[PDB]
């Protein structure tokens, strides 16, 4: 749905989604839950924001993967499972993240 | 009295405490592996940046609760087992969840 025909709330949710993605490295599902649970956006505004904020979730997975590697010295395989099972990144996002680790 | 690099490590440590919310042990490792500080500069920074690790545990507890819809008890275990916060930091964090 085009940006100009969308409620103000959806545009504010997009602004908030961009803030979260630039600071905390969330998967689409983590961000979807954050916008509803913390910011109190409706499910529809959150669902719109996670898809329409220009977020590259492969890059989000890579940044989270680097954090796990640097803060905890977790193995690439342990990081891949954590990103999928726990953070709820897709398998392809987690595979891309770990292929770009040290 | 302290080297410039110890003071920039403190300034870097404060940046993580305002946006990322790492435990002392996660931050100690981060400053070395990611930021390329010496182990001595990192060990100094994690203790001398005025960081409240109780507050860091609470901020990280809120992230788990809202991003993953985690229960208070699952968050408590996660903060200790995964994040390496102390038990006292994790107990404070969970007691302060709404």
SSE blueprint:
Two copies of one chain form a homodimer.
Chain A: H1 8-23, H2 28-37, H3 43-51, H4 57-72, H5 76-86, H6 91-99
Helix pairs in contact in A: 1-3, 2-3, 4-5, 4-6, 5-6
PDB class: protein binding
Keywords: HTH fold, superinfection exclusion, lipoprotein ektodomain, protein binding
Assembly: dimeric
Which sequence of SSEs, written as H and E, runs from N to C of chain A?
HHHHHH
Oligomer: homodimer
Which structural class should the secondary elements of chain A be placed in?
mainly alpha
The radius of gyration of chain A is 14 Å
Largest interface: A-B, 18 and 18 residues
What can be said about the biggest beta sheet of chain A? none
Organism (chain A): Streptococcus phage TP-J34
Protein name (chain A): Putative host cell surface-exposed lipoprotein
Domain Putative host cell surface-exposed lipoprotein Ltp-like HTH region (chain A): 9-52, 56-101
Keywords (chain A): Lipoprotein
What's a quick, concise take on this entry?
Chain A is an all-alpha fold.
Tell me what the structure shows.
The structure is a homodimer. Chain A is 70% helix and 0% strand. With 102 residues, chain A is an all-alpha fold. The first copy, chain A, folds into 2 domains: 1-54, no CATH class; 55-102, Winged helix-like DNA-binding domain superfamily/Winged helix DNA-binding domain (Arc Repressor Mutant, subunit A, Orthogonal Bundle). Chain A binds chain B through residues 23-24, 26, 30-31, 33-34, 37-38, 66-67, 69-73, 86, 88, and chain B through 19-20, 22, 26-27, 29-30, 33-34, 62-63, 65-69, 82, 84. Chain A: This is Putative host cell surface-exposed lipoprotein. Chain A: Keywords: Lipoprotein. Chain A: Residues 9-52, 56-101 form the Putative host cell surface-exposed lipoprotein Ltp-like HTH region domain.
């Amino acid at each position: 749905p085009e940006f100009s025909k969308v409620p103000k709330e959806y545009r504010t949710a997009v602004s908030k989604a961009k803030q979260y993605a630039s600071t905390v490295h969330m998967s689409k599902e983590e961000l979807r839950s954050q916008l509803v649970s913390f910011d109190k956006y409706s499910q529809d505004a959150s669902d719109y924001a996670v898809e329409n904020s220009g977020i590259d979730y492969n890059k989000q997975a890579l940044e989270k993967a680097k954090q796990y590697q640097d803060t905890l010295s977790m193995s690439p395989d342990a990081i891949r499972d954590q990103l999928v099972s726990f953070d709820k990144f897709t398998q392809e996002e987690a595979d891309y993240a770990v292929a770009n680790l040290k």
